[PDB]
Ligand binder design. Structure first.
Ligand SMILES: [Mg+2]
Ligand SMILES: [Mg+2]
Ligand SMILES: [Mg+2]
Ligand SMILES: [Mg+2]
Ligand SMILES: [Mg+2]
Ligand SMILES: [Mg+2]
Ligand SMILES: [Mg+2]
Ligand SMILES: [Mg+2]
Ligand SMILES: [Mg+2]
Ligand SMILES: [Mg+2]
Ligand SMILES: [Mg+2]
Ligand SMILES: [Mg+2]
Ligand SMILES: [Mg+2]
Ligand SMILES: [Mg+2]
Ligand SMILES: [Mg+2]
Ligand SMILES: [Mg+2]
Ligand SMILES: [Mg+2]
Ligand SMILES: [Mg+2]
Ligand SMILES: [Mg+2]
Ligand SMILES: [Mg+2]
Ligand SMILES: [Mg+2]
Ligand SMILES: [Mg+2]
Ligand SMILES: [Mg+2]
Ligand SMILES: [Mg+2]
Ligand SMILES: [Mg+2]
Ligand SMILES: [Mg+2]
Ligand SMILES: [Mg+2]
Ligand SMILES: [Mg+2]
Ligand SMILES: [Mg+2]
Ligand SMILES: [Mg+2]
Ligand SMILES: [Mg+2]
Ligand SMILES: [Mg+2]
Ligand SMILES: [Mg+2]
Ligand SMILES: [Mg+2]
Ligand SMILES: [Mg+2]
Ligand SMILES: [Mg+2]
Ligand SMILES: [Mg+2]
Ligand SMILES: [Mg+2]
Ligand SMILES: [Mg+2]
Ligand SMILES: [Mg+2]
Ligand SMILES: [Mg+2]
Ligand SMILES: [Mg+2]
Ligand SMILES: [Mg+2]
Ligand SMILES: [Mg+2]
Ligand SMILES: [Mg+2]
Ligand SMILES: [Mg+2]
Ligand SMILES: [Mg+2]
Ligand SMILES: [Mg+2]
Lengths: 97, 95
RNA sequence: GAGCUGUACGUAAGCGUUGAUCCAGAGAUUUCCGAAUGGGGGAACCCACUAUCUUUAGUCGGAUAGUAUCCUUACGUGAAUACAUAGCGUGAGGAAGGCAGACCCAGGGAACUGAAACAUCUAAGUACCUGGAGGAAGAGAAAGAAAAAUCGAUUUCCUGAGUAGCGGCGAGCGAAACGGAAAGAGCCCAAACCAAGAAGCUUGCUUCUUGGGGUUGUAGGACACUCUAUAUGGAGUUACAAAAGAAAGUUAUAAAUGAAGCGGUCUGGAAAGGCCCGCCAAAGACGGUAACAGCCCGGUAGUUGAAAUGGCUUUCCCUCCAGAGUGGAUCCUGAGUACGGCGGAACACGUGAAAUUCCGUCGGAAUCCGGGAGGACCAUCUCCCAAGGCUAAAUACUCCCUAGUGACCGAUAGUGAACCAGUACCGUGAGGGAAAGGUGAAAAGCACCCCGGAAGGGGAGUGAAACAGUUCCUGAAACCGUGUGCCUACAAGUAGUUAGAGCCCGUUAAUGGGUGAUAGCGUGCCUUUUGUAGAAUGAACCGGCGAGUUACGAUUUGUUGCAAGGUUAA
RNA sequence: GGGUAGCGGAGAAAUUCCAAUCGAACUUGGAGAUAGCUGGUUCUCUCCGAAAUAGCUUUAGGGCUAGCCUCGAGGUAAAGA
RNA sequence: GGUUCGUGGUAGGAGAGCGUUCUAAGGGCGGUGAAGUCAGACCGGAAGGACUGGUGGAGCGCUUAGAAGUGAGAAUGCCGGUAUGAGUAGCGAAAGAAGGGUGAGAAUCCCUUCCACCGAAUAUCUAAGGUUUCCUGAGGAAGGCUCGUCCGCUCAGGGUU
RNA sequence: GACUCGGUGAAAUUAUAGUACCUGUGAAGAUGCAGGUUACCCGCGACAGGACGGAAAGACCCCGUGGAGCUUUACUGCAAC
């Protein structure tokens, strides 16, 4: 309340809408994949058993933040262009489940 | 109550401890007892009442029942009281 | 198992081991009023009638029983009106009223208030009124939730989430499903059709009652055939049909038994306390007892106990009972219903793009080649089968009962009410509504003497104490007095303070106490104000009571644990 | 002895009367209504210490942001006086 | 431990504490006298705390933590008590007097006589309403605006055909 | 009636009071502050100038995004027709 001066929120317009079908992916940055042993197959079920992602919202998406050392066969629902390149640059095979 | 009228009790507390008497009356609602020659009080009696001369009457006053112990004629000592059944009715027993 | 005839301060007359009083179960009696019901009535009263009996010479009296109204249902009578219906009468059943100021469901339904005004909106479907109830109610076995590809009645909790939404898009309002739990249980009809009547006479076709049958979705049933059951088995009064009993066990409603110190000594009115020795403990709970007790008393742990009544659990009795497969000719599967228009309401959802659910009104389907839903609507797909009914548990609340608990109160508190309190008192009435606890261990409650009409005292006595004396533990302050150390009748005073003689004392022994001639200085406290000694506000005084709290969220700082992790909720 | 009752009665009319209440009785409840107003708000010492302004406001004795106070923490061509 | 600069203060911010009730745990005090209460010339920087003695007659500190119905001088606060005004206003329309009596006590109760007042009432019935106030015998705390031996008051008995 | 005596015995009010006057000062009108001027201590009967005396949180006046009653071609409604 501003003692009758029109409050800030009424001076400015409403914006946008909420998507009923909004997807939100659990994010896994390369750095945490180093945790795993070399020549390992990394699945969603393995990522939740390890406890790297507890809830798997809409699917698991791999992002590039950091760098990767080990050779891994990483299956996730999504990869960033940089993720795919970085996993492959180490010598891995990204599968999209 | 562990004692009743007729019983020979020993007094174990108060100014009259060591003194034994006979139970003249029991007031089980008050949990008090009247022992012959125990707890003498000087009652300042006006003449009007039974006693047409009146005067300072030296009479017994009730004692609390938990202040007397029953006498066993055999031992001749104060004793706690247990209850044993002969067959028809139960009777008090010394221990 | 020895006293008893209730409080409570009596007098009298009595009762009781040939077992009283007392405690528990079961009976009997139970005036009048009150729904109040034979009629009436200003509740606790008045006045009957009809039988039967009783009393009197008969009136006059007495006793017992019946006699309200409505609904349902038999039976009888029975009008306008011929049959008949209404009406009227009799007999059965049933209802009526109350309440736990709670919880539950329904009908009806505010306003203050919030929105810094106010009308939509909020408060709130709250308060309140009315009806219905039940120990719970409501809900409930998908025309469901969904779309991880599946789940499998309902309810309640955690979560989702202050999210999605709603909203003068303001104030505010605010889900649900998924997921996790508690608890779990499923059933009966209507209709095809079969049999038996009954009627209409559509006169062998139709609709009405009773029984059988039958209960559901890529369908189920009827209907055809087929296999076994016809109590072999199975199931029950909590739904699934309904009323009966027994017996045994167990719990409740009285009780019983129950260890160990009269230990010594000290103080004291008294010992349970101190000091010094013992002892019991499945018992060191609690209370009482002349101060604080495991061993004094009632008890406590443990172990026993019920003639009678009630509850519960079993077992027996009793009662009741068909359930698989195969086809799809035909038939059945809830109609003024679903749905729609108009007007409202409920849905978190304010008419909105408004699905879903209900009410009034009007219109009004399909009916298995069928129908509904998936948030306008169409198509596809998926899931379901409405317009009939029943259903325990997990949930809500507490007038009550039993046993317990409290970093809850302790007499201005705690209930309004510790005490004869919803009393006294106030009010025409609805209604409002107090104040008021403590002698002592024990009445031992003050014989007797003295003054006084008494009251009240002073002795004497009781008691540990009476300066504990029947309202009587303690006994503060205001306020009222008596006595006196210092001062005071030439003084102008917010009353003190600083200096200070004199006089009087003698301490928690201090460069002490009381008083104060005289001298200097000096306009209370609080509130509110630019500013108050204020001729502004508040307080007569003293005492008690009397105002930032808690819950749930948000945020920030501190602390602690763990740390790319941390943490669980029910 | 009766009748009319508060969103109501009654009034040869005054806002007149309806139980010492009437421009809308009384009582209980909603209810601790709301009160930007007035009053009040209880122990101590230590350190610091304002404001009575601007802007906007159905705002003017209210409020909000800023200014001025305080506590903590940061950071350095130290920028303050 | 020193040095330097500081230490008036309303609203208000910050800090450290005092005291109250209750709980826990340790450790104590108390009938050879607890709490409370009264008094005092004692101690601490403050809130406050001891000690000694009287009263009191049975419970209460201390330490460390914890929790709050946690502190009053003001609210025309609420309840209670008690002042002040003050021996003041008032004692509610009115004619009394003396003698005798009763009694502890008499202007005030009883009796006598005279006087005075009402008399379309201040008389006699009676309805309402009240509900025992009626009668008799005791009484004199309170009530009665004084007093009181008296009473519509207190206590007993009675009384309505 | 007042007043005196005997009996009985309230109240409003009240921060504490040892409570003069003048001129001044001050929140601008002082018993209480300053400078002076007066004044022995305690009462009783009287009078009201002051204590901005008591009494009532001023009814006038203004203010409150307070009420209430009333009006209408204020707004929005509702009955009724
Ligand atoms: Mg017997
Ligand atoms: Mg009757
Ligand atoms: Mg407002
Ligand atoms: Mg024993
Ligand atoms: Mg001795
Ligand atoms: Mg004692
Ligand atoms: Mg005791
Ligand atoms: Mg509609
Ligand atoms: Mg709505
Ligand atoms: Mg649809
Ligand atoms: Mg319709
Ligand atoms: Mg539909
Ligand atoms: Mg859709
Ligand atoms: Mg939607
Ligand atoms: Mg169907
Ligand atoms: Mg009380
Ligand atoms: Mg007390
Ligand atoms: Mg007394
Ligand atoms: Mg002199
Ligand atoms: Mg002179
Ligand atoms: Mg005043
Ligand atoms: Mg916080
Ligand atoms: Mg009137
Ligand atoms: Mg309300
Ligand atoms: Mg400063
Ligand atoms: Mg505006
Ligand atoms: Mg300072
Ligand atoms: Mg200074
Ligand atoms: Mg602070
Ligand atoms: Mg105490
Ligand atoms: Mg005291
Ligand atoms: Mg308090
Ligand atoms: Mg006070
Ligand atoms: Mg006077
Ligand atoms: Mg006078
Ligand atoms: Mg006079
Ligand atoms: Mg008179
Ligand atoms: Mg005349
Ligand atoms: Mg008389
Ligand atoms: Mg008198
Ligand atoms: Mg008399
Ligand atoms: Mg006089
Ligand atoms: Mg002047
Ligand atoms: Mg002067
Ligand atoms: Mg003055
Ligand atoms: Mg005045
Ligand atoms: Mg005013
Ligand atoms: Mg006014």
């Amino acid at each position: 309340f501003e003692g009758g001066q029109l409050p800030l929120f009424r001076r400015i317009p409403k914006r946008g809408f909420t998507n009923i079908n909004r997807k939100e992916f659990a994010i896994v940055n390369l750095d945490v994949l180093n945790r795993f042993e070399d020549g390992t197959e990394v699945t969603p079920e393995l990522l939740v058993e390890t406890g790297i992602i507890r809830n798997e919202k809409s699917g698991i998406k791999i992002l590039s933040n950091g760098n990767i050392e080990k050779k891994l066969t990483v299956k996730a629902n999504k990869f960033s262009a940089a993720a795919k390149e970085a996993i492959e640059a180490a010598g891995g095979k990204t599968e999209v489940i | 109550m562990h004692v009743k009228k007729g019983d020979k009790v020993k007094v174990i507390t108060g100014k009259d401890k060591g003194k034994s008497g006979k139970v003249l009356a029991a007031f089980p609602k008050k949990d008090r007892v009247l022992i012959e020659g125990i707890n003498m009080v000087k009652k300042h009696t006006k003449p009007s009442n039974v006693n047409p001369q009146g005067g300072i009457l030296n009479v017994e006053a009730p004692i609390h029942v938990s202040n007397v112990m029953l006498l066993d004629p055999k031992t001749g000592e104060p004793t706690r009281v247990g209850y044993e059944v002969k067959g028809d009715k139960k009777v008090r027993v010394a221990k």
